[PDB]
Amino acid sequence: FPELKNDTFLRAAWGEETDYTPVWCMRQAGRYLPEFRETRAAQDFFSTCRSPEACCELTLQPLRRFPLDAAIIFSDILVVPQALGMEVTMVPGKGPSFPEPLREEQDLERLRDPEVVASELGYVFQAITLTRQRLAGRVPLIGFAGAPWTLMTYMVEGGGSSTMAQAKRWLYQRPQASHQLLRILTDALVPYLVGQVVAGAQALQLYESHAGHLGPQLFNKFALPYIRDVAKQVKARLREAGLAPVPMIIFAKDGHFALEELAQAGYEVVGLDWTVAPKKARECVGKTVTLQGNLDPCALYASEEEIGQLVKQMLDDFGPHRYIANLGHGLYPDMDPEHVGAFVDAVHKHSRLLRQ
């Protein structure tokens, strides 16, 4: 594996000082890129995806457009439940979909044993190695998965949902089954993440995109302890394996009420959405974790000149050290790539102007 040239992102992640502020975006490989759609057209979403050459291509597309400071591997968080033996359908251009969600506790019998899963996800490991090779040391490469609770919500709710009602019903009516599912998810995630790193990933992101739906009490019973194991166990297995640990990032969408513990869940970076004021967050987390975020993605709909200023403002709030710039959620499919360019330039231009 090629030696990394730009490593600003990794050093920012670990807390080390840097000459400028690194930047990347969730869903940087996404439908807002025309070239993305002309390469999605190649096949049905989940074998594309299953083709190493195709993921690599997508992963690289934005990097050809913009001096981003990391690449994140192109995948869907649904691969994991799918590897567990849950059938996905691509319903009338409306996206991810389990036609037969888990509803009663017996349903759990349907699932694969968690340890074999890693072997079902060999195409991903392959795509990572492919991609780590072709970036050829330009920037580091982030692997990723969705956090146990999040996946649980997709498996139980089937599609997406405004309230997570079916899923929370499980939490309140079937605590044990819930604990059982969550454990299965954790034990699946660990070997998948270790895998990614063994396969060449240099940083790992965990997405808890459905944090918001839980409150403090639920979140500590059913989200936290699992968010914590993943970090714990992944760090261990890497050690036993003689491999260097990679920086880990928890991103709890709408998890303002959780920042305190996330800072001590043993992740190196904590992702923020745009609804947490940056200073409030620094406060909540203290000074030995790095923060990432948190421009409102919609902000990109503004002029490039307006974009610059909002960015300037964001930087002032987070300050020089311990900070990786990013949006508050992934890019939207109707965003203009020229405005993403603007966003990227503004971070760089202004983080330097901030120091010098």
Add this chain to the structure above:
Amino acid sequence: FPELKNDTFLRAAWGEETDYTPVWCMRQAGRYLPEFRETRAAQDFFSTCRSPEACCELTLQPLRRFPLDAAIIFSDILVVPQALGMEVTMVPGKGPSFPEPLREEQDLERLRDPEVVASELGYVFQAITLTRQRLAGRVPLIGFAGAPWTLMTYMVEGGGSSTMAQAKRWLYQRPQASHQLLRILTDALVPYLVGQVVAGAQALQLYESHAGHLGPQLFNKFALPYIRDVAKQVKARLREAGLAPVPMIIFAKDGHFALEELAQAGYEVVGLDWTVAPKKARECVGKTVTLQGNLDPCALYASEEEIGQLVKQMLDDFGPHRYIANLGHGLYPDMDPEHVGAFVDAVHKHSRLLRQ
């Protein structure tokens, strides 16, 4: 108008001490009640609604079931945009819907002059008077509207939406048009709310159910200043009219980042969702506003015995004074009315047990 017997809710609202904790629920008149659906079956949703006798009936249905400490008038927050001249459809049992949403600035020409709106909503005023009479002083009666930004999102987005992207696009690409729409909404809301009170409402609730989608910066530009006018102007007009002011409640769903200003927006009560820890909120608002909330609605899916304890816990957190108990969002349509009963009893049973 009949003299009010139980007024615990009003005295709690104003900050005055009380022997127990008053309680009510958003959507207490809702599809979780069987009798609600056998009376919804009477006609298509919006003339039912347009029939005073029918709203009154719905408004009263839960009060016959449970010792609630207020009644809230049955209505939809969509009446206002509708009165402004926007056509609603009831699409295949999936709910509220504007088939032709506002998309470009010219669209605004379609809207009625805000001052005449009040006269289009005469059925509501009527339903209030009817209902104030039939409660016959048992508990106070809350009127309600949706806050300017929220309505804006429905008018621009048409249906409901995970991201509010179309709407936020407006905020970022058409600040003036946005300001213009928001103003029209404010000027519509004020005479509608005054109306409700003139018609017999004793407390008013404002719903900013789409606060979460804005961050601090957006929220202060485009939500706050309007939330503030409504309160301001409504209080004035009531004074000019020789009428007593009623307690006002702002409920910003997911508005944790906003609590500070909402406490000084000049509302008497501030509504909380279940994602704000009660103590954190008391902190943010200080000690001269009353808080309301904030049990996670899904909590009702638990046993009645589990319900009791979670409630006990909530009470301990909020403490005796300056507090109206309630859920974090409205009830869900598959909840068991016997568990709502449990929720109501537990507040009462435990708020007393707390004092004595």
